Amino acid sequence: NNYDGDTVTFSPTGRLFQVEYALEAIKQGSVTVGLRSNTHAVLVALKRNADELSSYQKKIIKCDEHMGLSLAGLAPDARVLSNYLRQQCNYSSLVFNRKLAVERAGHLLCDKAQKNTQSYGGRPYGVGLLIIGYDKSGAHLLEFQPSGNVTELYGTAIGARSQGAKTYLERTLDTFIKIDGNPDELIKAGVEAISQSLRDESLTVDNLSIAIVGKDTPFTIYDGEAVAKYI
Amino acid sequence: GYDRHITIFSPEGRLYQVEYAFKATNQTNINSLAVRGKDCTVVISQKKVPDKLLDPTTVSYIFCISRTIGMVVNGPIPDARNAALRAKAEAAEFRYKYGYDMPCDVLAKRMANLSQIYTQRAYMRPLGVILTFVSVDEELGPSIYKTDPAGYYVGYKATATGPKQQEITTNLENHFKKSKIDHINEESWEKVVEFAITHMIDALGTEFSKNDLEVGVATKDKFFTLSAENIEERLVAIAEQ
Amino acid sequence: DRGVSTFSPEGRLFQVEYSLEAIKLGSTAIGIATKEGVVLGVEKRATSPLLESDSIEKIVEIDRHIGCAMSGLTADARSMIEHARTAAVTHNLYYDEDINVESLTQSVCDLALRFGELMSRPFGVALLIAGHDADDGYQLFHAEPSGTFYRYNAKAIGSGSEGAQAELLNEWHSSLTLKEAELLVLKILKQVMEEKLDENNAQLSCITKQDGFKIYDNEKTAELIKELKEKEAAE
Amino acid sequence: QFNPYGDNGGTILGIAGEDFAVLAGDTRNITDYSINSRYEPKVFDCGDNIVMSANGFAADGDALVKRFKNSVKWYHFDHNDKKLSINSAARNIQHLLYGKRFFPYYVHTII
Amino acid sequence: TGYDLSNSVFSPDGRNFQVEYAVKAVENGTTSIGIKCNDGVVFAVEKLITSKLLVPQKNVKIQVVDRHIGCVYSGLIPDGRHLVNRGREEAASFKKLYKTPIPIPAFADRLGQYVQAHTLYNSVRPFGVSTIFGGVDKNGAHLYMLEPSGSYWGYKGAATGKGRQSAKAELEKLVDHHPEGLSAREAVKQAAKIIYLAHEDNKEKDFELEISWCSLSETNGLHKFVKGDLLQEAIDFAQKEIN
Amino acid sequence: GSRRYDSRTTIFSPEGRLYQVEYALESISHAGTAIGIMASDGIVLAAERKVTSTLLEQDTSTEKLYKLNDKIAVAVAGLTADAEILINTARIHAQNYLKTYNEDIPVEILVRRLSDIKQGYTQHGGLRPFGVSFIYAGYDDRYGYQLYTSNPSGNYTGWKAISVGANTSAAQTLLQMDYKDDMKVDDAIELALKTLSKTTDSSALTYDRLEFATIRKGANDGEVYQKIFKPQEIKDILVKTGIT
Amino acid sequence: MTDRYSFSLTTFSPSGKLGQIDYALTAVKQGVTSLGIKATNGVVIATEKKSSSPLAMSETLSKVSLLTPDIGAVYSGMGPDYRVLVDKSRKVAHTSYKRIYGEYPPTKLLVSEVAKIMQEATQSGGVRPFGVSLLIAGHDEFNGFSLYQVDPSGSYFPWKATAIGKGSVAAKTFLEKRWNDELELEDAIHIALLTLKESVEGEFNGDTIELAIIGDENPDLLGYTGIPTDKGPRFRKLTSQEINDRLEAL
Amino acid sequence: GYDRALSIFSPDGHIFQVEYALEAVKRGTCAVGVKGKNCVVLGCERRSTLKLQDTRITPSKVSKIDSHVVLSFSGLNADSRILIEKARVEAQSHRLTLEDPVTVEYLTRYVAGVQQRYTQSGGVRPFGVSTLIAGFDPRDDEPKLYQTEPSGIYSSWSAQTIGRNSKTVREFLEKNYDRKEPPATVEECVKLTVRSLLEVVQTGAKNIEITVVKPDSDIVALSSEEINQYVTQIEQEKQE
Amino acid sequence: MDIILGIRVQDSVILASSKAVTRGISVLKDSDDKTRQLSPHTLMSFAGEAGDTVQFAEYIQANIQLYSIREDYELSPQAVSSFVRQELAKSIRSRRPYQVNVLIGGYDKKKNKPELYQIDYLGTKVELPYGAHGYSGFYTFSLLDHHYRPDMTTEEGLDLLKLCVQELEKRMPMDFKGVIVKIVDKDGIRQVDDF
Ligand SMILES: [Cl-]
Ligand SMILES: [Mg+2]
């Protein structure tokens, strides 16, 4: 009310309203799902269009051969953060000849988002990210929120009506975690998960966006006729 | 009324932020006192440790700035420590640049000038503290100089600071009316500490145990704080008289 | 007052949302993408009859394979175009090739959000960036001051945008010829324009693989206007 | 006085055919009259069917290859996974090299 | 009024309302504790299991500074991480110049001055965390607790977060019943109990226990996490006491 | 942050006026009147000191009239402290021009630059404008004798006769009435004093409440002399014209 | 972080008033009375030493300050603002004058430099004006003896005699009756003490009054001998005993 | 540095500071530009509340940017000096690098670009000035007349006016100026410009300034008597 | 670059400047004009380091032309020469100084007097009846000491100048490919085409 003019101001109950309003931009964004087994990690994203004449807004971004994310909210902020991740992944490779750990990737994003919430003039990032990766400690899935809070999970979903997919994954936890050495079945579980967040619309050929990373699989994105298999 | 939020003049020629910083001084509810002997300068302060979980050895409002200068603070600990760290750096730098130990009164002026800057420049707030500096200066002898959030400073024959400061002040005033002199006519610093504690007991009207007090003593070429057992020994001497 | 980069309670940047209102006040611009080329057309909208309408430059060349049409506070577009042209030429210098239409659009959209307390406010102008490259062929992009860009088969921006977009929805198909697309822009411009459409108050342009980006003459557009009126009367 | 350059020796060779191309190089690395390695490769697969070697001062050579490999990576990110053509790679390398016009990479480069 | 809208503005009381508002964010956060022991310190924290989908043991909240200092905090987790990052820089520059690892009191002031600096200007926000930290140095064991204002003291036991009063009460009993001192292995077991008892103030979601420790004898003066058999032993001890 | 306390000194009103410039002009309207009159053979500068006290040292005082170089002088109306900042800039600017071209600065060039400085304070920087209006009186070999004025807006204009400060409306009417183009310096001296004597808020105009200066070619052959009048010299010129 | 106050905190109000300057002058009005009188062969400046506490040593607090060997200064208003001005005034005398010309600045020019500092606090970003009025007394070879007043605006005026602060209105009236152009220095010290007794309420002696003169050269106060041209400082601060001597024949 | 974003968007999609700068232009004295077949003429109003002026030394309303291009304006006078100076510097800089004087379109584009930069730069307000820029390109006999405004938009005009009561004089020019046949001679163009100002001015004495620009750096300012002859001729023909 | 001369007579200033531009063992050009018009009644000839000469001349030209437009007034030859001297005086203590020597010939319209200023690359200004830079002076100065009179006409000045060029063509080691002569007077600047 009087305490939402900028990010530098706390409310009387100890709340940062600009950070909460940035969080609200994620809820308006299109649904995306993340899940993993022990061998692979999968991102499934529902893309959104302006109208029938427009293209469908690309949700998934590659960061390295072994890491990438899906976005929900302000796309330009996801571009800024994914670019920062690309640089940090790249710095780790050039200097240390070392693939960047997915956990450290999260720690770096947390600290970048935090600085924007404690200084005058700047603003919080208006986007949520789901980072998947395969590193030296197996498959990983992270959930980034622009408050700074990063969380490692077996599965999750963010965006509009994400609670439907999140409930499904909470029931299916024991099934999909043991889909080891089988990419297609782990995607199928992810496609079935995102389907629980659909209303009126259904998954079409240029609407669905899938990505996968794993043991002997680089981070690759599937769009168009390549995702017709999973409808 | 944004003239009450930052350090600019109000219609009646006042700086409200400076005045409110003065009120932050008493937020700890601690009373301090400082007096001068022949050879020494004693400073005493109340020590209140309410929480049982606190480590009482780390609860302190007296600071060793340099080897010769000591400082007691009335005000919140963060601002107290802020002021202490800066004073330490300033005293060290002074020695390096000018080849001799920074006098008590010169440090007081320097910290006062820094406090003045916060009353004029808008981006910096005043510190909510009153800094009492004590030493045995090699030129001026026993010395007590005190700084406040307004940037004011002055030397003292003796002084007191805190919520019940006025009761302690008049207690000391009445003594110096009677003695007809500027200091405590006493040979050892031990008895000057006994004087300081005695006159605080009379003014505040409370008794003190060893853990209720905190004592700093400045002699020629060193300033030091007393331990609990050093104070207990000092309390026993008062009781047996 | 309040911060420039402040979020509203609904999760949108105030200044970005206000700049979008400025773009709605601007003159109409329409783009249509086909397999034979991309057409760009604009409403000139002279404020007075004494103003020489040929000096109204609302369609602009970025490179030989990329064109651009604008709508809103058109003065703000000068530094955007300047950056686009430099980006296009600079890429050719570094890589000895034409730059992808998408990569050019992305480079322009990076400027968009570089504002705050960098420039003092967002841009008050939307751009239609039309071009061709070897990889993705004929492309039309809509670049906003939010930093977002969408590819389109066809798109209208400006004051008559919502009315024109609904018309483009029905009329566009994947087998449109270039000639058909030229007439369709003129048709839809004439519908949404306040004053009566002619060669002086409206301008056409296109980009083809063979001839590159070309702004049409007033003589050439006039014949396409005459051809359009005859075809509508013919049924 | 400190000399920032050295000569690691070796030799490389590129030949182009009708539908193929070779880039060869010996595996010996040397300083003065001593052998450092009998097998230290200096012809590298950089991706996009581009092979590269930067023979001369090995530290500058490795630095350049490392930078070009990185340039290929960022070309994919910035331009939608587009294949870097051999002619485009060449022009990119010119800018890498000339960027150090006044403190050069002491290498003969072949791709 | 309007004295609470801007940081670094004194109210007519002499208070900085923005700092007090940051304390409310700390009070909202999960419970965390610190226990000083014979030859070291023990830290513990409550991790709320929001979902089955959280990977157990893989959202670590306790952070190490240098090799000998442990830090835990309650409130805004990102703010805590920012403070530790600074701590690590402060500890690194101390060791760079002075060779010896940073003493705990020395380290405590480096954070304290940094946190206090964020109450001096309106262009910055105060920290939304109370930080419990400590370790073992040349002078023995030290435990500290630092607050949004920059205020810190040494502690025998320390607690902060939503269940601070429950934990404080339980800590006060340990100080009374063990005047000669508490051992390192005991303090790990007690820490588990106190988190389980303090969980009664946050009992909608069930939780995950996380403990760490520095001890001159048990961990050789270095910070380590309690895992495996020793962790399960402390959990079982805590489970037996609640029933 | 600090946005809360920003007055925004360099903005437009809805009517298209600069708030701070208008208010600075309102300040200047209460300052002591200063008059400039340009004759064919010289220039007069006259100014009224602000409510003098009897114990003010009059002979070793400088409030209104300042020397910029040997050929140019200014009469001040507004904040003296502000004027001195601008005067020292102008003095320096004159010496830069002399050092560069080995020629005394043309009057307009000095005026333009000083007025451009004032302009800057109204368009950028977020600072308050200078609460000062100048009357520039000077000579160069291009335009001869010249009178200019500048104000806080940074706008300057040329004049045959002009007043700034208090009662300019009444003063300008009286100058417009009695001024003519073939006028001499001695006549202009008399006009300047008569105008102040009628527009003054004081009871009677006396020597101790005035500063006076002339710029004549009254030196020996084709050269300009600046005369800043002494107290006794103002007393004599006041008796000579029949005011006291 | 960083000083984000790059804008003026003193601005013109619709009426043409500069609010902060007016309010600074109000702070000067509240302040303790000080005065200055110019004689034929000297200048005197004086003020009351308002003690904050009787335990406080009023000797350590110096309201009358030496700026150069021939120039002194006294104030009314906020003491801390005065103290920093004296520091800056002393330094500027060296940097902008003595290090260039090899000699101390004349009174009028040092006053001008102080005025400049006080004007900048009226216009620069993120600062309030100084809450003091200064009275600067001094001597230099070509201007002789002089006395200046400097206000928060940065404006300065030369005076034969004047007073500032608490009871300035009454004090200026008293000085108008007693001042003439033939006053010797001792006569001016006498008048200064008479004028100051009116404004002082409590004790009136050498320990509660601070008074200094700009008079003849003092070779004894120079510290060295041998250079004939160097004859010593014209600024002298009168001792507590020296004041009490003149209070008996009052 | 002073960073504040002074020019910003409002809920209805307007930048008020830019729009309020247009009000300053509307307050300013009227200026008119008319281009003929082989010339351009710039007319300017001078308000007659100022007597006892010295017209020798007072800043003239029309300013030469180069020997072949001129700039008149309406709005804040102090602001206009800054634009003129920048334009003059750019005019010489163009000659230095391209070895050819500026085109009128290029000089306009530069000045307009400066005006635009001040609508989205931190710490600055927009220029309270609209300009009319007129002249002839190098080795070209086609007349050029351009207009700029605080927002930064610019465009070419057969004839145009700006400043106070400009909507009255634009109404006059819209019916009296024929596109098919512009003023064939210098006299015809000056007369139409003087006529258009006489709709607004008051008296045709020392209130109207006229500056004629012809090809190949041929610029001259008319005197009082020369302008007064047009005023005398128009009034006699009017009485009919 | 090499030979630049200057002669001030009764009513004009005459500047002669060599046409050759040599680099290495090749005369690249034999028709080079080593001068720039700074203003209608002021001409500057120049000689020195390759590149620096023209860059400096044009930089000065731009500044004087800017002044002319701003004030609508021609700067005096004395004023221009002082501006040029100061630029060279700054230059000499720079990281890389302009190695350019100049002659400034102008007609002062206020005084109705021709003026010739000789300024070297250090910023050493002198007003002279006749001037030269480089080795040229070693022949021409002694020749002009003898033959020069202050009251000469422009035609007499051109014959005096011919006498200098003949001597230089006889005794100089390098072929400088003759000179371009220009006259500066009350009516402005004009070039003598047949010399
Ligand atoms: Cl200091
Ligand atoms: Mg020479």
From Swiss-Prot, chain B:
The modification Phosphoserine is found at S227. Gene3D superfamilies: Glutamine Phosphoribosylpyrophosphate, subunit 1, domain 1 (3.60.20.10). Its main location: cytoplasm. The keyword Phosphoprotein applies. There is a cross-link at K222 (Glycyl lysine isopeptide (Lys-Gly) (interchain with G-Cter in ubiquitin)). Keywords: Acetylation, Cytoplasm, Isopeptide bond, Nucleus, Phosphoprotein, Proteasome, Ubl conjugation. One of its GO terms (biological process) is proteasomal ubiquitin-independent protein catabolic process. GO terms for cellular component: mitochondrion; nucleus; proteasome complex; proteasome core complex, alpha-subunit complex. It is found in: Cytoplasm; Nucleus. PROSITE patterns: PROTEASOME_ALPHA_1 (PS00388), PROTEASOME_ALPHA_2 (PS51475). The keyword Ubl conjugation applies. Pfam families: Proteasome, Proteasome_A_N. The 26S proteasome consists of a 20S proteasome core and two 19S regulatory subunits. The 20S proteasome core is composed of 28 subunits that are arranged in four stacked rings, resulting in a barrel-shaped structure. The two end rings are each formed by seven alpha subunits, and the two central rings are each formed by seven beta subunits. The catalytic chamber with the active sites is on the inside of the barrel. Interacts with CIC1. Belongs to the peptidase T1A family. Present with 15200 molecules/cell in log phase SD medium. This is Proteasome subunit alpha type-1.
Curated annotation (Swiss-Prot), chain C:
The modification Phosphothreonine is found at T47. SMART domains: Proteasome_A_N (SM00948). Transmembrane segments: none annotated. SUPFAM superfamilies: N-terminal nucleophile aminohydrolases (Ntn hydrolases). Gene3D superfamilies: Glutamine Phosphoribosylpyrophosphate, subunit 1, domain 1. Coiled coil: none annotated. GO terms for cellular component: nucleus; proteasome complex; proteasome core complex, alpha-subunit complex; proteasome storage granule. Belongs to the peptidase T1A family. Present with 17100 molecules/cell in log phase SD medium. NCBIfam families: PRK03996.1 (NF003075). The 26S proteasome consists of a 20S proteasome core and two 19S regulatory subunits. The 20S proteasome core is composed of 28 subunits that are arranged in four stacked rings, resulting in a barrel-shaped structure. The two end rings are each formed by seven alpha subunits, and the two central rings are each formed by seven beta subunits. The catalytic chamber with the active sites is on the inside of the barrel. The proteasome degrades poly-ubiquitinated proteins in the cytoplasm and in the nucleus. It is essential for the regulated turnover of proteins and for the removal of misfolded proteins. The proteasome is a multicatalytic proteinase complex that is characterized by its ability to cleave peptides with Arg, Phe, Tyr, Leu, and Glu adjacent to the leaving group at neutral or slightly basic pH. It has an ATP-dependent proteolytic activity. The gene is PUP2.
Swiss-Prot record, chain H:
InterPro entries: Ntn_hydrolases_N, Proteasome_alpha, Proteasome_alpha-type, Proteasome_asu_N, Proteasome_bsu_CS, Proteasome_sua/b. Its main location: cytoplasm. The proteasome degrades poly-ubiquitinated proteins in the cytoplasm and in the nucleus. It is essential for the regulated turnover of proteins and for the removal of misfolded proteins. The proteasome is a multicatalytic proteinase complex that is characterized by its ability to cleave peptides with Arg, Phe, Tyr, Leu, and Glu adjacent to the leaving group at neutral or slightly basic pH. It has an ATP-dependent proteolytic activity. The modification Phosphothreonine is found at T58. This is Proteasome subunit alpha type-4. The gene is PRE6. Present with 16800 molecules/cell in log phase SD medium. GO terms for cellular component: mitochondrion; nuclear outer membrane-endoplasmic reticulum membrane network; nucleus; proteasome complex; proteasome core complex, alpha-subunit complex; proteasome storage granule. It comes from the Eukaryota. PANTHER family: PROTEASOME SUBUNIT ALPHA/BETA (PTHR11599). GO terms for biological process: proteasomal ubiquitin-independent protein catabolic process; proteasome-mediated ubiquitin-dependent protein catabolic process. The keyword Mitochondrion does not apply. Keywords: Cytoplasm, Nucleus, Phosphoprotein, Proteasome. Gene3D superfamilies: Glutamine Phosphoribosylpyrophosphate, subunit 1, domain 1 (3.60.20.10). It is found in: Cytoplasm; Nucleus.
From Swiss-Prot, chain I:
GO terms for cellular component: cytosol; endoplasmic reticulum membrane; nucleus; proteasome complex; proteasome core complex, beta-subunit complex. GO terms for molecular function: endopeptidase activator activity. The modification N-acetylmethionine is found at M1. The modification Phosphoserine is found at S76. Its main location: cytoplasm. Pfam families: Proteasome (PF00227). GO terms for biological process: proteasomal ubiquitin-independent protein catabolic process; proteasome-mediated ubiquitin-dependent protein catabolic process. It is found in: Cytoplasm; Nucleus. It comes from the Eukaryota. CDD domains: proteasome_beta_type_2. Keywords: Acetylation, Cytoplasm, Nucleus, Phosphoprotein, Proteasome. InterPro entries: Ntn_hydrolases_N (IPR029055), Proteasome_beta2 (IPR035206), Proteasome_bsu_CS (IPR016050), Proteasome_sua/b (IPR001353), Proteasome_suB-type (IPR023333). Non-catalytic component of the proteasome which degrades poly-ubiquitinated proteins in the cytoplasm and in the nucleus. It is essential for the regulated turnover of proteins and for the removal of misfolded proteins. The proteasome is a multicatalytic proteinase complex that is characterized by its ability to cleave peptides with Arg, Phe, Tyr, Leu, and Glu adjacent to the leaving group at neutral or slightly basic pH. It has an ATP-dependent proteolytic activity. This subunit has a chymotrypsin-like activity. Present with 21800 molecules/cell in log phase SD medium. Belongs to the peptidase T1B family. PANTHER family: METALLOPROTEASE TLDD, PROTEASOME SUBUNIT BETA TYPE-1. The gene is PRE1.
